[PDB]
Design a protein around this nucleic acid. Sequence first.
DNA 1: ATACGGGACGCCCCGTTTAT
DNA 2: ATAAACGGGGCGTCCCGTATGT
Lengths: 200, 193, 194, 204
Amino acid sequence: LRAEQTRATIIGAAADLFDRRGYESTTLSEIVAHAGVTKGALYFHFAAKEDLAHAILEIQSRTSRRLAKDLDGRGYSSLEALMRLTFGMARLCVQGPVLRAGLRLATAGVVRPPLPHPFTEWREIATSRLLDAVRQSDVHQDIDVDSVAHTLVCSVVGTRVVGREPRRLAEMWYILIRGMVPVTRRARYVTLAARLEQET
Amino acid sequence: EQTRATIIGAAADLFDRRGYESTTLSEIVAHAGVTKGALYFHFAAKEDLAHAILEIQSRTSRRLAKDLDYSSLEALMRLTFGMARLCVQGPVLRAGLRLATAGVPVRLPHPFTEWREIATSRLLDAVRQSDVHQDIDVDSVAHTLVCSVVGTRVAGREPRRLAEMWYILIRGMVPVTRRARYVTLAARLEQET
Amino acid sequence: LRAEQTRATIIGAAADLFDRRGYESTTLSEIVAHAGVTKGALYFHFAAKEDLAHAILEIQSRTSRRLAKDLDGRGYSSLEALMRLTFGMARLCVQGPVLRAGLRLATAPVRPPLPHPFTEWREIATSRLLDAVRQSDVHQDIDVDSVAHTLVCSVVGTREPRRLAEMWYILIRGMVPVTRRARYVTLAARLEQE
Amino acid sequence: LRAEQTRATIIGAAADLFDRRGYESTTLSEIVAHAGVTKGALYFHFAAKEDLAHAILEIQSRTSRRLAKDLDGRGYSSLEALMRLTFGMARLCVQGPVLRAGLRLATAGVPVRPPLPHPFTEWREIATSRLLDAVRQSDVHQDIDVDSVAHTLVCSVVGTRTLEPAGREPRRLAEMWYILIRGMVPVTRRARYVTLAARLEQET
DNA sequence: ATACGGGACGCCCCGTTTAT
DNA sequence: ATAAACGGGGCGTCCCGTATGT
C-alpha cells in the first residue's frame, strides 16, 4: 500500500547494508535511518531482524526460480539456458543490492526449513540442467556431472565476487566451456558468453 | 606464550562457529579457562585476536609455499591440495577463511589478494616454462582458481572436488601432451586422505 | 450500546491478565490478543491502558455500594450488617476475576474523584462501627480503628472464611459487651459460605 | 573492595524506589540515577534486575531470623518474644527502605530463579511456633485456634498503608496488638502486655 | 473502528579502562 | 593476568495517533 512502498524500501535499505557490512554488524537503526523510516514503522513489518535476513533470502530463492521459468519454452538449448540463467542472476547483483545481499547471507545461518538454503536450489538446478545438456550431445558423456555442478556454484560465487562481476562470470564460463563442451560446440557458446556479458 | 595459544585456539573455534561479530569476550574468556584480565593483557582488543588469527594463516601460508624444490604448475597444483588439507587441520586456519568471508578488518597484507597474487606468480612461471599455454590469461585463471577453492560449503567431497576441477583447468589450459602427467597427479593428490 | 458486549469482554480478559501477569507486566499485545479484539477496537472503547485499570476499580466500588446498600435494606443490626458485608465483599473476591484484579490494582494510581478503595473501605467500616456503638452492640470506649488493614490480607497473603470468622471471634470478644457476644459469634460461625 | 559500598548503595537505591513505585514500574535508569552508579557498575553486581529483587528479598528473610536469634537468651518467651520480634521488623521498616521494599515485593510479583525464600510461610511458621508455645505457658487459651491466629496475625501485620504516612507504622502495630490481646490472652495477665506494647511503641 | 506508522525507552550486556 | 567500574548502544516492543484502500 503505502505499506508495501515502505515494506520494500526497508528491505531495500537493509539489503544495501547487509551486503556492504554483514547481518551481524548492521545496526537495526543504521537501517531505519538509511531507509528513512522509524523503529516502529520497521517494527510493523519486521519484529526480529532475521525477519529481514529471512525475507531477503526469501526474494533471492524466489526470483531465481522466476528466471528458471522465464527461459524454457523460450526455445533454448539446455546449456544455453543454465548459462544465460546465471548471467540473469549476475544481471541483478549488478543492479540493486537485494541479491548481492542474499548471497552474503548465505554464510549466516542466523538455516531452518522449509527455508530455501540457497545452494541445493542451485546445485540441483544445475546438476539437472547439466545432466540434461549431456543429452543434446553438448557436454561429454564421460564427465562426472555432479562434480562439475559443485564447482560451478562457487566458480559463480567468486571472491570479491564473494563488479565487474558479469565480466568475471563471463571468463569463468570461457575457462569452463573450453574443456567441457566438445570441439565444435565451443563456437555457439564462447560467442554466447561474450554477448551475454556485453548486455546482461 | 602457552596461554597466548590457548586464547586464540578458543577464539578461533567460537569465531568459525558463531561468527566474529557475535562471539563475545565473555564467551572467549569463558571457553578458554583464562580470566578476562588475562585476555586483555595478551591482546589489546577483540580485533587483535582476529588479527592474530589472520597472522597464523597468512604466515603458515608462505611456510607451505616454502616447499618449492619442482614444476611451477606442480607446486601450485599441490599448493592447493595442501592448503585445503589444512583449512580442515583445526579451527585457527579454517577460522581464518571465516574471518576472510566476513567483513575483514586488516593490518597484514590482504586476505585473497595475497592468494590471487601467488596463483598468478606460479601460473606466470608455468607459462614461462611451456606447462601452460602462452595465451591463456593468467589472472582470469588465478582468480577462478582462488574462488573455486571454496567449493560451496564456506563433507568428504573435498580433494574429491579439487581433483575434478583441476581437470577442467588442465583440459583447456595445458598442452595436449603435458596434460596427462598433471591429471594422474591430481588423481594422486586426491588420494591424500 | 448493545455492542458494549465487547467492552465487557475487553475488561474480562484485561482483568484476568492483570491479576495474573500484573498491571504493566501485562501488555496491550496480550490483552487484545486474549480479548479476541483488534487494538483499534480497544482504543475506540478505552482511551488508554489505565482507562482499563480505571474502568475496573469503578466496577469494584460500584459493588461496595450496590452490595452494602442491599444489606442495610434488610432489618439488620449495624454490627451485623458490618460483618455480613465483610463476608459478601470477601466472597466476591473469592470468585470474581474482575475484582481479584480490583484488589491487585488497589495494592500496586486511582483517577479522581474516586476515593482510593482502601480509604473508602475504612471510612465505611468506621461508619458502621460507629453506628453499632450508638446501637450499643460495641463498647463505647474502643477506638473505631481497629479497621480495614486486618481484613484485606486475609485474601492478599495468599477455604478462608474459616480465617475470616476466626478474626471476628477475636474482635467480638473485645469490643462487644459480654452479654451480646452470644449472637454475633454464633452468626460469625454460621457465616461460612453458609 | 569497597565494591561493597556501591553494591550496598545500589540496593538502598533500589529498595527505596522498589518501595515507593513498585518493581515493574522502576527503571534501571532511575536506579543508577539514584545510587549514583553507572549501568555497568550496576551490572557487575546484578546481571538481571530480578537479581536486584531476589537479593533484596534475601537481605530481608536473613535480617528477620537475625531477630529470631537476638530475641532469645531468655529475653522473654512465646508472646513476649513474638511481640517485640514483630516490633523490631517494624522498627527497621521505619528507617531501612530495604525492609519496606521487602514486603512490597511479597505482595506484587516475585519473579523466577531458585529458590525465593517465601516471606510468609516463613512467618506463619515462626508465629504458630511462638504462639502455640504460649498455650504451653497459658498466656493464651486452650480453646484458641492457634493456626487460625497466625494467619490472622501475619495478615494484619502487613496492614496496608505510602497509602498512609510512614512513621505511623509501629503506631498501627501497637493497636493491632492491643486488639489481639483481649481476644486471646488470659485476663489474669493482659497487664504485662498492654504496657509492653504502648511502651515499646516509641522504642524498638 | 484497520492498518500502518511513530517514537520512546527498557533491559540487557558488551568491550573496556582505573584503583592498584 | 584481578575485581570493580564504565558508558555506550543493541534490540525489542510497547502504547499510541494519523491516513485508510480490505
